[PDB]
Amino acid sequence: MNQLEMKKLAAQAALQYVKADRIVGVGSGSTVNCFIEALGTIKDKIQGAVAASKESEELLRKQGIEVFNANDVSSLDIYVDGADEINPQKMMIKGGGAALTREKIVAALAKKFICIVDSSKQVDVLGSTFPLPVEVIPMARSQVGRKLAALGGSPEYREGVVTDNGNVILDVHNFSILNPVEIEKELNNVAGVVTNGIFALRGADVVIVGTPEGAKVID
Amino acid sequence: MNQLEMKKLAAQAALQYVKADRIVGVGSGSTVNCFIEALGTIKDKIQGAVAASKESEELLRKQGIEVFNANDVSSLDIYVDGADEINPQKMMIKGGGAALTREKIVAALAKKFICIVDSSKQVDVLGSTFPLPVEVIPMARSQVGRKLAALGGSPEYREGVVTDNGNVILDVHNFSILNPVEIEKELNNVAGVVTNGIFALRGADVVIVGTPEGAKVID
């Protein structure tokens, strides 16, 4: 079984958490795109969706699903999204797809965070297999890079990339993250950092993993 | 004298901190505008400036001063900026002029934060005379508004304002800030908040107050 098949398995299993006639919180990225197709498969069952990227929005509308603005809801029952790494404590590293800012915002509206992932995303130590994405105000790029290096990392600017919010992304190499909640908060106080890729203060509530033996739910 | 004359006195006094052949960090707002005019006065003594707003940038260029990008420097000797409130510990509330995000970015670059105010800006309790400005990603406006109400404030969207960074502002009324350091950190952890107007983790180093009796320096 290949990686795409596993993503499809997790996405299909996520449908079990979708409540009739309600608005679904949707993330961004390749695994979520599998979820957007799955959603189109049961669309009349839902009221619509709130999505974490303009790409996800366009795809959802292409499926005939109405897209609502986050500002139109006081909360969401669930938020379904993938991750670049996820540890046994359900803490994640996100941002490979450069949508981490709106992903953190939509996740904050949802009661239940359902992370859908292929088996390869499960790691014991966050940051060991994937560089930490950090979204940065453009004029703050150099000084945030200096802070990240002082913290022990090797920041690298993602060439030519701009987020839906108009910011740049610095990916931090050589930065194993032994204490995720602590680093998340610390980076949150750095001027110029819009969002950092550690989702630890509010991690996943449910983890759906696509494996060769089928989707496995950790709830 | 009125506040405009007190602002000019403080701005004139800030000049003594400007040294030759150096890039000056400059803020934004009515008091800084008096400082920019003062800077023009010694134009040729300085190398240039890094500014906290497009408006400050424009005024500086009109004074014949070269404007540099923050990314062009690794450090600034001083940063001159005003404030809406400042307490005896030199902690400030800023953002009346909607430039708080970039102001916090440039201030982080400077060795010495020089706050120039008229005497009406001195208060014993932050939030007692001025609603707290909070810059928010537009799609997160409603949810951040609900969080601010939960912390006990009365948030009000600043109608029609869009910051240099493309964001909106929520001004929090009836919100006395009894522990600025704690509150600044708490707000920095809210998804959707770009910057909050409490400058307490990094307050002013020098305070120059314009008074009917002349500018008074609190070094």
PDB file of C-alpha atoms in Angstrom, chain B residues 70-165:
ATOM      1  CA  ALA B  70      14.381  46.536   8.872  1.00  0.00           C
ATOM      2  CA  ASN B  71      15.782  43.429   7.077  1.00  0.00           C
ATOM      3  CA  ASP B  72      18.770  45.577   6.022  1.00  0.00           C
ATOM      4  CA  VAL B  73      20.092  45.932   9.579  1.00  0.00           C
ATOM      5  CA  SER B  74      21.051  43.557  12.344  1.00  0.00           C
ATOM      6  CA  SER B  75      20.433  46.175  15.008  1.00  0.00           C
ATOM      7  CA  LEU B  76      19.434  49.832  15.654  1.00  0.00           C
ATOM      8  CA  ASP B  77      20.891  52.044  18.395  1.00  0.00           C
ATOM      9  CA  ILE B  78      17.607  53.785  19.194  1.00  0.00           C
ATOM     10  CA  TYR B  79      13.902  53.602  18.395  1.00  0.00           C
ATOM     11  CA  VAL B  80      11.835  56.726  18.999  1.00  0.00           C
ATOM     12  CA  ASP B  81       8.086  56.240  19.297  1.00  0.00           C
ATOM     13  CA  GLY B  82       5.061  57.653  21.102  1.00  0.00           C
ATOM     14  CA  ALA B  83       2.480  55.832  23.243  1.00  0.00           C
ATOM     15  CA  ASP B  84      -1.198  56.100  24.186  1.00  0.00           C
ATOM     16  CA  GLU B  85      -0.491  55.356  27.872  1.00  0.00           C
ATOM     17  CA  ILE B  86       2.713  54.757  29.828  1.00  0.00           C
ATOM     18  CA  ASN B  87       3.001  53.686  33.450  1.00  0.00           C
ATOM     19  CA  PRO B  88       5.734  54.413  36.042  1.00  0.00           C
ATOM     20  CA  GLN B  89       7.496  51.147  35.067  1.00  0.00           C
ATOM     21  CA  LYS B  90       7.688  52.419  31.472  1.00  0.00           C
ATOM     22  CA  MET B  91       5.258  49.788  30.232  1.00  0.00           C
ATOM     23  CA  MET B  92       3.052  51.203  27.470  1.00  0.00           C
ATOM     24  CA  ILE B  93      -0.238  50.735  25.670  1.00  0.00           C
ATOM     25  CA  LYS B  94       0.138  51.527  21.950  1.00  0.00           C
ATOM     26  CA  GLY B  95      -1.872  51.093  18.756  1.00  0.00           C
ATOM     27  CA  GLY B  96      -4.120  54.173  18.724  1.00  0.00           C
ATOM     28  CA  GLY B  97      -2.468  54.961  15.410  1.00  0.00           C
ATOM     29  CA  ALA B  98      -2.939  51.379  14.142  1.00  0.00           C
ATOM     30  CA  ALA B  99       0.819  50.769  13.681  1.00  0.00           C
ATOM     31  CA  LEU B 100       1.432  48.458  16.662  1.00  0.00           C
ATOM     32  CA  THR B 101       2.583  45.383  14.706  1.00  0.00           C
ATOM     33  CA  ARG B 102       5.466  47.098  12.922  1.00  0.00           C
ATOM     34  CA  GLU B 103       6.240  49.227  15.963  1.00  0.00           C
ATOM     35  CA  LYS B 104       6.758  46.070  18.025  1.00  0.00           C
ATOM     36  CA  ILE B 105       8.958  44.674  15.211  1.00  0.00           C
ATOM     37  CA  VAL B 106      11.222  47.751  14.955  1.00  0.00           C
ATOM     38  CA  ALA B 107      11.401  48.177  18.720  1.00  0.00           C
ATOM     39  CA  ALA B 108      12.709  44.578  18.971  1.00  0.00           C
ATOM     40  CA  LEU B 109      15.629  45.706  16.791  1.00  0.00           C
ATOM     41  CA  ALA B 110      16.649  48.630  18.956  1.00  0.00           C
ATOM     42  CA  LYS B 111      19.036  48.766  21.812  1.00  0.00           C
ATOM     43  CA  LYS B 112      17.275  51.743  23.365  1.00  0.00           C
ATOM     44  CA  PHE B 113      13.516  52.392  23.215  1.00  0.00           C
ATOM     45  CA  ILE B 114      12.923  56.174  23.631  1.00  0.00           C
ATOM     46  CA  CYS B 115       9.251  56.941  24.303  1.00  0.00           C
ATOM     47  CA  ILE B 116       8.220  60.551  23.598  1.00  0.00           C
ATOM     48  CA  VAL B 117       4.902  61.712  25.037  1.00  0.00           C
ATOM     49  CA  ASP B 118       3.082  64.805  26.265  1.00  0.00           C
ATOM     50  CA  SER B 119       2.262  64.702  29.977  1.00  0.00           C
ATOM     51  CA  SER B 120      -1.320  63.528  29.443  1.00  0.00           C
ATOM     52  CA  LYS B 121       0.028  60.077  28.462  1.00  0.00           C
ATOM     53  CA  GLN B 122       1.268  59.275  31.981  1.00  0.00           C
ATOM     54  CA  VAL B 123      -1.131  57.020  33.877  1.00  0.00           C
ATOM     55  CA  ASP B 124      -0.807  54.833  36.949  1.00  0.00           C
ATOM     56  CA  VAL B 125      -3.053  52.130  35.621  1.00  0.00           C
ATOM     57  CA  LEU B 126      -2.858  50.928  32.041  1.00  0.00           C
ATOM     58  CA  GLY B 127      -6.219  50.565  30.343  1.00  0.00           C
ATOM     59  CA  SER B 128      -7.777  53.106  32.705  1.00  0.00           C
ATOM     60  CA  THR B 129      -7.988  55.919  30.137  1.00  0.00           C
ATOM     61  CA  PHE B 130      -7.553  54.087  26.860  1.00  0.00           C
ATOM     62  CA  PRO B 131      -9.096  51.003  25.211  1.00  0.00           C
ATOM     63  CA  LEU B 132      -6.503  48.319  24.368  1.00  0.00           C
ATOM     64  CA  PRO B 133      -5.805  48.030  20.616  1.00  0.00           C
ATOM     65  CA  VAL B 134      -5.534  44.439  19.321  1.00  0.00           C
ATOM     66  CA  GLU B 135      -4.538  43.677  15.693  1.00  0.00           C
ATOM     67  CA  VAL B 136      -6.390  40.665  14.285  1.00  0.00           C
ATOM     68  CA  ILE B 137      -6.320  38.536  11.092  1.00  0.00           C
ATOM     69  CA  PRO B 138      -9.647  39.536   9.498  1.00  0.00           C
ATOM     70  CA  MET B 139     -11.086  36.053   9.315  1.00  0.00           C
ATOM     71  CA  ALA B 140     -10.555  35.700  13.092  1.00  0.00           C
ATOM     72  CA  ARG B 141     -12.333  38.935  14.081  1.00  0.00           C
ATOM     73  CA  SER B 142     -15.392  37.367  15.653  1.00  0.00           C
ATOM     74  CA  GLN B 143     -13.648  34.630  17.565  1.00  0.00           C
ATOM     75  CA  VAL B 144     -10.979  36.991  18.961  1.00  0.00           C
ATOM     76  CA  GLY B 145     -13.766  39.363  19.915  1.00  0.00           C
ATOM     77  CA  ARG B 146     -15.382  36.553  21.940  1.00  0.00           C
ATOM     78  CA  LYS B 147     -12.083  35.733  23.663  1.00  0.00           C
ATOM     79  CA  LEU B 148     -11.554  39.381  24.642  1.00  0.00           C
ATOM     80  CA  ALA B 149     -15.111  39.550  26.108  1.00  0.00           C
ATOM     81  CA  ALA B 150     -14.331  36.386  28.073  1.00  0.00           C
ATOM     82  CA  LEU B 151     -11.191  37.996  29.521  1.00  0.00           C
ATOM     83  CA  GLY B 152     -13.584  40.682  30.735  1.00  0.00           C
ATOM     84  CA  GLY B 153     -13.273  43.417  28.150  1.00  0.00           C
ATOM     85  CA  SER B 154     -15.760  45.081  25.766  1.00  0.00           C
ATOM     86  CA  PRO B 155     -14.162  44.737  22.296  1.00  0.00           C
ATOM     87  CA  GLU B 156     -15.208  47.109  19.517  1.00  0.00           C
ATOM     88  CA  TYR B 157     -14.199  46.671  15.907  1.00  0.00           C
ATOM     89  CA  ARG B 158     -12.464  49.843  14.639  1.00  0.00           C
ATOM     90  CA  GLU B 159     -14.735  50.588  11.645  1.00  0.00           C
ATOM     91  CA  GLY B 160     -13.147  50.795   8.218  1.00  0.00           C
ATOM     92  CA  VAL B 161      -9.559  50.660   9.411  1.00  0.00           C
ATOM     93  CA  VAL B 162      -7.107  48.305   7.706  1.00  0.00           C
ATOM     94  CA  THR B 163      -3.496  48.268   8.933  1.00  0.00           C
ATOM     95  CA  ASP B 164      -0.333  48.417   6.826  1.00  0.00           C
ATOM     96  CA  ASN B 165      -0.349  44.606   7.171  1.00  0.00           C
TER      97      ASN B 165
END
